[PDB]
Amino acid sequence: LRNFCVFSSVKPLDFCDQYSSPCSSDATVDDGWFVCEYHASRFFKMEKLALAIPDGTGNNYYRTVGKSLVDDKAEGIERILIPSQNNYETVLNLSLLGPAERLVFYMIYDNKEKQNEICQQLRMYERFRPEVVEELYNSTLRVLALTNPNESRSFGLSVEDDLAFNVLPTFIQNLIRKCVAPESLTIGTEDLQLRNANTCRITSEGLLASVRLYNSVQPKYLYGVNENRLQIRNVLQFQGNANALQQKLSRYELYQINIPLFLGKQIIST
Amino acid sequence: LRNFCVFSSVKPLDFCDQYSSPCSSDATVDDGWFVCEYHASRFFKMEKLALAIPDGTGNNYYRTVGKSLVDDKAEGIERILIPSQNNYETVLNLSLLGPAERLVFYMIYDNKEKQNEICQQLRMYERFRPEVVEELYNSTLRVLALTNPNESRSFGLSVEDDLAFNVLPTFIQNLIRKCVAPESLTIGTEDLQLRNANTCRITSEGLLASVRLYNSVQPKYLYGVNENRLQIRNVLQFQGNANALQQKLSRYELYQINIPLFLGKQIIST
Amino acid sequence: LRNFCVFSSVKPLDFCDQYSSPCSSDATVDDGWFVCEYHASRFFKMEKLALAIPDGTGNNYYRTVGKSLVDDKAEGIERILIPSQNNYETVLNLSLLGPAERLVFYMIYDNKEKQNEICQQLRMYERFRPEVVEELYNSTLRVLALTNPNESRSFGLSVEDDLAFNVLPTFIQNLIRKCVAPESLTIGTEDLQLRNANTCRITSEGLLASVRLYNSVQPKYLYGVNENRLQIRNVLQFQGNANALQQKLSRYELYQINIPLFLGKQIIST
């Protein structure tokens, strides 16, 4: 598979002579997400980060991790990173989404009746192109087929988190496992405490950024705004003086205020 | 002051024709530490980091913060970042240190009898140079004089941490205030939760890295080792395969596993 | 009199070889204020404006008027333009002011006992210069002597405003008469309604900017700020787009949002 993004196969179902997939340049690597960074930020509000674990001889074990794009001002449904099968339609706005994306999301969350209904209502578009729904279905199914089942991953200090994670779909479970780093890894015979407190939670609503940590990250895809019209807000302002703002400290190494997803424990022994 | 490091004035007290201070290139900035990064790493086992707080209009308020160089394997006295006046002699190995560094540390921790004793025993070195102890004393005193007393900083959730921080010397208090970032800043009328859990603690022993977080930082000054002789240890090893170690994820943005000092709350209102 | 400002004679009472009066360039004209624009803005928070009344043949009758520098956010004592004799000490901060300015203000508000006390306590400064208090007293008295009594000016729709204006000192009365323009002038045999509503009020507290009109004027003397330190505020922000902000309308003639002092009626018949 040249492109591993599950949404890569989504194309306009009308008679389009040419189309370019909006997947990012990182969609060609098989990191286990099966979603490109652009689609992860657009739908699940996450970006991709690398986590290097050094053994002590030079080799580094790289593990992918999700960086939350949810701001501290966001509340309620805006804090849901990965919606669960209970309320994914409202979180992802499936009704407003196009039929291809809607069908892909239905297959991802394993809603057989909805997939069948969407297919039987998209039969007519087979007139424009004989592969509007067939090849998309085959590609999405073959991409999802790689997510089915030494690692021992627990996603919480209570059985509630584990049972909430268990009932999630297999693709959602794989995405959560790949995007959520452990609070305290257990590699070989030693424990590596990556962080002392959790950053994301797993409940019936799905994977959320429960803690109100400050996010100082500029999204690389969710950055455009309607510059033409006018908006009113009460922002915080500083003077703009180098001595007052201590701008002379900018030459020092910058500690990025990011929100990587850290939750639970992982055990890697082999 | 061209050099703001308190240890910058330390020179060999013998008849030395020339001497170059070991202070780093960052010793020329007035960040409030009054210790260069080299001396901070050598004595207090900390490096310097910058923390940018954006107001929302473009201007960034930069605050210095200490990055802990203490590894997770370190235990006991090895975890003491800033020794308190109770046990600074044993932590810093003052007896083994040279007379100039010993006198500077005595003045920093405000031990009048020890300063007087060291001065009266260093009178003889005035024969070699008439400024072995005079100009060093004046420079160190004038550097310390900048540390004496809108910000409201609390260094813990209990009164014990506050009372432990209060009894510390004024230079140590200033260094802790500059190097320890708040867990949850309170700027203007809004709270910015930098981190949800503390990373450093303040007790009678001083400022310690109590939590056993994994440190994956390579020191830029405490890196030399005795390559000539032989040492034996049981390190962890990986295979060294790109597919096994997921080296293809190295192109992604790296989440540095650092240990910045976060503790307590800060209030900035003006 | 080359300089008509009442505060022009104020000089440091110590042995000063040279001194330059801080009076503005407009202090040389006799507009009836007897206070320069700089001092009027510094003390009474007013600037000077000209009001041209055309008769109909080309000649223009120019009348001076006060422009209020009080912002809409100011409240209470900050809204007092000209303090009355009841509470001028607290409004003008006479205790903090220098002895020369304090004595000048005491003479302006006609407090005989305070003038005598300040003089008998400034006798000693006659040692440094034999004209520290003598020539200042003579100059201030001769400047005030021009303010003593066809125009018929009423400063309100009720007798309360008139009685409040009557009890004010003669210099304060002259300043109010010169700085406050009439709401509806009555010249010759015709009425000219300059404005339909009042802008300043006269009560026991003095002359105040009672109405919360928006002030969009940049003071030409009260503009300096402490740029070195840091301040926090929640300002309003716009996007900064020409189409959104309608910047293309900047080429049109600008209606300045000023707050000139308009109150009561004036009758000029001769």
Next chain:
Amino acid sequence: LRNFCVFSSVKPLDFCDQYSSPCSSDATVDDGWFVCEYHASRFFKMEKLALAIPDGTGNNYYRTVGKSLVDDKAEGIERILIPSQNNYETVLNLSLLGPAERLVFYMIYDNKEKQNEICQQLRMYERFRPEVVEELYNSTLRVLALTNPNESRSFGLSVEDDLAFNVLPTFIQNLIRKCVAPESLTIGTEDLQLRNANTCRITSEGLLASVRLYNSVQPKYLYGVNENRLQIRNVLQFQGNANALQQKLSRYELYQINIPLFLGKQIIST
């Protein structure tokens, strides 16, 4: 549209080889008036002014506003700034106006029968030019089409003003909204009191300058007079002496006695 004036398309309907539109140089900007300053002064007796609202960071929101050219001596119909659909024919003297201007005004006030009658009586002029009425109709209709429907504008303290404004034509409503500034704007979460009293009123007669404020503005287009013949009037006269007229105050900043249209409240929240 190079020219946004609704009267720009008005041309002599006879066989004219060349014609220059009398629109002012400001007719090329899209300020929402859709009438040039020359035509606004000629018909509606208004000039254009800019009103800058500063947010507090440097950006200025510019809003157009109408300056009344009605003198205080004007009475009755002479005080009608924008005639309503009830009596626009008598105010604008439609019968005396040319057929092109009459048809344009009929389309502006939405009088379908009159537009049809004027068109069927201007068919004959199609002999001279085949676009005497066609292109004029298309241009005027396309200009009017931009006036059809976060801002919340109230044009009075009583329901009578609102209902009088509602029944007005859409072009007249847009012109009134653009030309009449609010007495007290409400931007973001704060109120900016531009003026404490209204200056223009809206009744069944239309938009009038009800208050008899003195107008000291020299029109830039309604300035020509019949110099050849003789006229008699009893004007007011002054002496012409610098000391008597206080001409020395002319160097001060001049407070222009204008009559901008201020009425009602506006709410801008987004």
